[PDB]
Amino acid sequence: EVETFAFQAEIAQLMSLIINTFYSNKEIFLRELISNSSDALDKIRYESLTDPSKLDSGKELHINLIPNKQDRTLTIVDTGIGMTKADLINNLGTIAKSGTKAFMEALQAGADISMIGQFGVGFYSAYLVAEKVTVITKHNDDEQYAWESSAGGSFTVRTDTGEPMGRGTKVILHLKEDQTEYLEERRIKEIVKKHSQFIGYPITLFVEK
Numbered sequence: 191e192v193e194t195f196a197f198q199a200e201i202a203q204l205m206s207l208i209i210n211t212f213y214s215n216k217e218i219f220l221r222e223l224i225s226n227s228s229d230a231l232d233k234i235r236y237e238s239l240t241d242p243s244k245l246d247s248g249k250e251l252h253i254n255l256i257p258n259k260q261d262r263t264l265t266i267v268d269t270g271i272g273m274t275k276a277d278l279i280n281n282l283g284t285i286a287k288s289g290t291k292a293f294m295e296a297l298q299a300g301a302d303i304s305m306i307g308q309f310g311v312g313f314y315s316a317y318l319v320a321e322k323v324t325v326i327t328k329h330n331d332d333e334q335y336a337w338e339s340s341a342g343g344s345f346t347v348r349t350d351t352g353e354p355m356g357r358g359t360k361v362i363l364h365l366k367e368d369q370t371e372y373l374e375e376r377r378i379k380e381i382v383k384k385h386s387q388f389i390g391y392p393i394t395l396f397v398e399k
């Protein structure tokens with residue numbers, strides 16, 4: 191049972207701008223997704239300060255980076271607060287309509303795509319390097335869901351029958367054919383050291399057979 195939704199016009203416009211603008215500094219997608227994971231981890235940590243049972247779904251607070259060259263995927267896993275179905279549909283828990291408006295206003299006032307995270311829509315920088323993005327998520331107050339989009343104006347949401355995650359979010363980047371440098375260990379390490387050196391959660395880069 192799969193539900194298909196239209197993006198709001200402004201988000202479709204943001205995604206087409208990210209996909210079609212010539213902009214060589216694509217590596218910032220990873221900084222933006224790690225920053226989103228850190229924000230999600232901060233949220234569940236804050237809730238746990240007054241209600242420890244919020245961590246019954248998992249006490250460890252971390253970020254894993256999992257490249258898979260066979261599948262041509264880079265997955266960013268975190269054990270943060272996750273998202274409900276309603277959050278997923280409402281632009282993955284962002285204020286993306288007003289964030290896109292602010293981002294566009296900034297781009298015409300000198301900004302570049304790398305500043306996208308300052309406008310709360312850094313998730314969509316995934317489409318700098320991915321032809322398709324799958325988001326698997328589990329929030330304490332809802333069931334596990336999979337969101338997916340290859341852009342083109344629509345996204346899908348379905349109940350996820352995959353491996354249970356406990357709590358958190360997994361962003362699966364199905365990389366464009368010419369963006370496979372982001373599966374190479376040395377390239378991912380370089381990006382994490384350059385842009386994510388002060389993130390307050392352990393970031394583990396998995397290796398492959």
Ligand SMILES: CNC(=S)Nc1ccc(F)cc1F
Nearest residue numbers: 291292293294295296297299
């Ligand atoms: C009321 N909001 C304002 S003033 N926002 C705003 C956003 C991006 C800019 F580049 C300039 C801006 F003024």
